[PDB]
Amino acid sequence: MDQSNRYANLNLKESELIAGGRHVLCAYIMKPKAGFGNFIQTAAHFAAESSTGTNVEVSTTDDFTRGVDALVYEVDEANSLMKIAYPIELFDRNVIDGRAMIASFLTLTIGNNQGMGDVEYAKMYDFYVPPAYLKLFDGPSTTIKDLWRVLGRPVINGGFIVGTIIKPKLGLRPQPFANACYDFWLGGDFICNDEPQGNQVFAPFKDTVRAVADAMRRAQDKTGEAKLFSFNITADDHYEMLARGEFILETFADNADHIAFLVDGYVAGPAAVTTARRAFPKQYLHYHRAGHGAVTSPQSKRGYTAFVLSKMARLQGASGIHTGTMGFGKMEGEAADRAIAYMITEDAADGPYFHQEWLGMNPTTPIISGGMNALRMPGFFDNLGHSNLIMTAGGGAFGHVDGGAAGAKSLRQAEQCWKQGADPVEFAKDHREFARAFESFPQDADKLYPNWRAK
Amino acid sequence: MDQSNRYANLNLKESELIAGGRHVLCAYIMKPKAGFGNFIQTAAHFAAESSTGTNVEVSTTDDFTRGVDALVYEVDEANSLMKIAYPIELFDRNVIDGRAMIASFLTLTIGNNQGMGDVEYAKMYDFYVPPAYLKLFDGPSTTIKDLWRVLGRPVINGGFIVGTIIKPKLGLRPQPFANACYDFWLGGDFICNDEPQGNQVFAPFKDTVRAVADAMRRAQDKTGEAKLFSFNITADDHYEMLARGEFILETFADNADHIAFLVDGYVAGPAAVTTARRAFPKQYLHYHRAGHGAVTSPQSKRGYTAFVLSKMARLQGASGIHTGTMGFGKMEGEAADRAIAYMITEDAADGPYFHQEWLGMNPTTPIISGGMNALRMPGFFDNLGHSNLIMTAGGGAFGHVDGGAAGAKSLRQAEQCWKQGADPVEFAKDHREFARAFESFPQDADKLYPNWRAK
Amino acid sequence: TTIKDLWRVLGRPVINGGFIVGTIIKPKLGLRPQPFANACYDFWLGGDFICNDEPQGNQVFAPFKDTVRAVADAMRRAQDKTGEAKLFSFNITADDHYEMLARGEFILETFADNADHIAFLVDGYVAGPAAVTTARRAFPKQYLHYHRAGHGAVTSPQSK
């Protein structure tokens, strides 16, 4: 069935749709399946399955329904580009507070349309939210601004937060776990659970937070500096998440504002992110995206990109989200991913297709992690352009030849080397922990800094 | 770094791992990326990133950690097959009730490993859960038995539940919405919100619930038969979901056990499914999987299959889940998808790689939907083998030439034709509504029943 | 919840799983927390199921939380010794709905990975259906052990 006459109107101007403030815009890279309709016909059915229609005509459709149709307003078959405008009245709102829910945005814009039989693949690369809809999202209530204040840093451009993940990913019992935290905090600022750490039978939850809380006090008394920890409170059950958060804040007591909450937002879902965002709005929400690569990978032509994921996370209320190492780490990523960081940190930024005004919505910190170490940091900061962020290096810290404490300092000195604009090799001659990272990761040192042993 | 000696033990026998009952087994179709390690090396790193390790050695690892390593126990590079055994001590448990959470299972078995830069793609096709771990999942609390009992049907093999989705997907105001519910209920059993219908400004939630409630009373008074409705309560906020469900049950009063709750479990996440499962255990939980096609599609070689998704849904507590039309509808699907239905309905069933014993865990109803109508139904039931299920036809019902009421009866008569083993064309000679479905969908009638006009 | 769910924990067939060997901790009252747990350990060496005697709860000589923690420890010791799963049914009866919740919530949390080994005993006759429903609707996935103390006042054939 050809529904292009109804669900496609290419005469609409994107600039007039934006100025109207009545439409969410989505840009897709789509390819029709062979043996069905052409590009515009497929894009039309795509819009029908994403708003008001199905695959056949129904007697219950009226002129009002047609008024809220999602409309294909731009196509470019040569580049497989498809843009669709969704009237904002389509998106579901809370009965309790009239606010928006990202779950409805996902259901319409990238839900059933991912299973259509007449489409080979379709992936969202960008979207635009107008003010009337943008302001209905929670946004972040805590930012890096609040971590800086705890660390004693300036609340404007407070700078780099040295971080790590406790490794092994799983296996450490409570006290060995806390001993590693104490070691790293002797030279570092931030520690977080590895995404799956929680209440394993060999490392009970409450036993572990108590041991970490003791380590934090010991590290703070020893170094005279404040230390931060991010606990994983992900769970299927809403009330399990609350129980973990409430116990943590109470146990850490006067160090409760040193605590962040980690959520595996992708596999647990927006509901888990919103649970932590609204239950603990004054606790830095640490968005972990394990599993995102199933759709975000460039190898995938379905779902949505990491850019789309990061932009959505800011609406959900993530204080910080993993944005990837941008090609400098062990995970898939590219240097152009720095545009993701600007989109979630700035009040105004450009996506691959749409410019976004955030209207003073709080920024989401870009959390850098994934095979990072002191040797890989200078090049990363060169690509991004700033270091007002959190970086966690698990293997990069506890894989240091001289231990986690030395690993912590190697990250500190690496960012100081970039801030000073110094040559890493020459800078290492006066910074032992940074120099020892070359011996800790000789393969990386050989590729990044040829002939480093000779200097 | 080569980690095959630690994270690979191909001398392990799958039959002993199963008999031991101490390991979750996962089968993946994996392909290493060019320019890195061979197959066993990639599979070993894959297992490390999915349990206890990272991409480098760390000083904190002890023997206890090594004991809980996930182990590659079987490979077949020719077919890109990789099997991994996850010790069940790795998976997180609730502090409040010590039960399992699917979020932990997803984070480890299909989380970070989807973003590994040394892997081109990896997709889970099957998994095995031993008794010690299986019995810790919620499982369904409400089944089709309870819908049959409300309909007055036998609680064993109660038969086919004629259903539909209110179309248009969006745009109907409260009372027009309810009028369409009444029309279909005159010949059908089951009606559900379309996945995005909820609290749109043009169709307020409470006004729609009240109008549908009145429609149910009018239809039951008119037909003398019980009627069912499945309301979408999906939301980011746990408390929004409770608010919608509590209001529905109070409004419907003595028809409260006629209510099912629909959840967009894929975009909202397991947390949303669990909210409905645990807050409303005695309300049929209707799992909707909008967005799943981004990973489950055979066009995708990442994430997991629809079989994996359905099996998890049964553990999560879904009373029913969409299993696709198995190639007979408008969405992607194949005839072999009937194995998904058997896996969620039987106490013992075979997956593509692992046999599963469910130990009496309640079944999940296979909900058939997606471009279905009376003409396509006989073929679908021949491939499945039974009709003890829910089938919803939005366009197939309200697209009927004579309206939703006649469309409802066409679906009823379509299954009666299959139960009687009659020829559709000949059966239509004595069943008006079914015959008029040929006129409603002539393109389908021409392909499925050549020369139907002459008879 | 049904005996099916106790059979599953014990490793029995979920249909016709067979006989569950059980006892009540005697004395009915008087045992202090650790002697109470020591009796639980002894029986579990040969049995499956243990329940509070109907009035056992939070007596001054046997505080509730201390007894729950000691019984929880005994269950691990007996399961680690025998290699078999063990079950316990705690009395959570109380006039105050929120007392019943407090008790049940603390038990499940304390037993942790053995939480599915726990049943909840309710003196349904003297406490009433309201107490039964509290346990039924607050803890649907915990075996509800209905104790009928006091029923003999009306059910006895001597009564008309």
Ligand SMILES: O=C(O)[C@@](O)(COP(=O)(O)O)[C@H](O)[C@H](O)COP(=O)(O)O
């Ligand atoms: O498990 C891991 O691999 C990490 O803890 C990094 O460990 P290392 O520091 O040892 O590399 C992070 O979870 C990933 O970086 C997530 O990827 P991303 O940030 O791209 O979402």
Ligand SMILES: O=C(O)[C@@](O)(COP(=O)(O)O)[C@H](O)[C@H](O)COP(=O)(O)O
């Ligand atoms: O929006 C729709 O398209 C449907 O209401 C079907 O409508 P029609 O009956 O009118 O076609 C269902 O939500 C999809 O079938 C879900 O797909 P699946 O079950 O494959 O996950």
Ligand SMILES: [Mg+2]
């Ligand atoms: Mg990690």
Ligand SMILES: [Mg+2]
């Ligand atoms: Mg639908």
Ligand SMILES: [Mg+2]
């Ligand atoms: Mg007694």
